[PDB]
């Protein structure tokens, strides 16, 4: 079964906002995969206090977010297609030391995958950057710089003996740190076109005014648009090599 074929007729869905955010899915469509990112801001300095990251369950008409923990905004992304996928499992590993690395369960292979890094506390709150994981490999390494807090590697693992040609895919992730005082574009290698991805902005002070979205499919780049404690623009996507 060609995962390209079904990732083009799948339907990305993104949602940003404070509590409550559960991004939902179209008629009889189901969450193949996805993830949720929560930001938590001190009740006084209003600076950042922490990141959190969770998985959307397989076969659900909603990203069930799953809180009694305060959290002040959540960026949510789900790929939502017709059916749940067989032999496919999602993963988050988090770390604090230099390395952060993840193996795939039942010896699977990365289909989708990326690391985010942060540095919520020194005093440079959004050190938050982004890295790609390679389709095909069983791992995903990611060394973090120092005075980083935590690294969040999230990957969708497929059983590489039924999902074919993962070696034909590639993950792109560009980011750029905008100041606190003008655009961001990233394009596929090997003249590739997008399968699925997301584009957004994050802050270390957030007033609640919204900014987040999804990449367009069978196209060749992904684009954002800028809307101390400064804030970052990012783009993650996955490409097939044509």
Author numbering: 559 to 625, 628 to 681, 683 to 742, 751 to 777, 779 to 797, 804 to 818
Which statements did the authors publish about this structure?
PPLPs are found across apicomplexan species, and contain a conserved central membrane attack complex/perforin (MACPF) domain, as well as a unique C-terminal domain, named the Apicomplexan PLP C-terminal β-pleated sheet (APCβ) domain, and a variable N-terminal domain. PPLP1 is implicated in cell traversal by sporozoites across the mammalian dermis and into the liver to invade hepatocytes and replicate within a parasitophorous vacuole (PV), as well as in the evasion of host phagocytic immune cells. PPLP1 also plays a role in erythrocyte egress by the merozoite stage (gametocyte) of the *Plasmodium* life cycle, via membrane disruption.
The structure of PvPLP1 APCβ domain was determined by X-ray crystallography at 3.15 Å resolution, to reveal as expected three β-stranded repeat motifs arranged in a prism ([Fig fig1]; see [Table tbl1] for data collection and refinement statistics). Comparison with TgPLP1 APCβ domain (root mean standard deviation, RMSD = 0.978Å between 170 atom pairs) reflects a conserved C-terminal domain architecture across the *Toxoplasma* and *Plasmodium* APCβ domains. Flexible loops between the inner and outer beta-sheets in the third repeat, which are absent in the crystal structure, were subsequently modelled in for molecular dynamics (MD) studies (see [Sec s4] below). Comparison of loops of APCβ in PvPLP1and TgPLP1 reveals that PvPLP1 lacks an extended loop and any aromatic residues at that point in the structure, containing instead several polar and aliphatic hydrophobic residues, as well as a histidine residue at its end rather than a tryptophan. PvPLP1 did not bind to any mammalian membrane lipid species tested while PvPLP2 recognized anionic lipid species, with a strong preference for phosphatidylinositol 4-phosphate (PI(4)P), followed by palmitoyloleoylphosphatidylserine (PS) and Cardiolipin, and a weak association with the other phosphatidylinositol phosphates (PIPs) ([Fig fig2]). Sets of 20 simulations for each protein were performed. Only two binding events were observed in PvPLP1 simulations ([Fig fig3] and Fig S6). Similar binding energies of −15 and −19 kJ mol^−1^ were obtained for PvPLP2 and TgPLP1 respectively, while the absence of an energy well for PvPLP1 indicates it has no affinity for the PC:PE:PS (45:45:10) bilayer ([Fig fig3]).
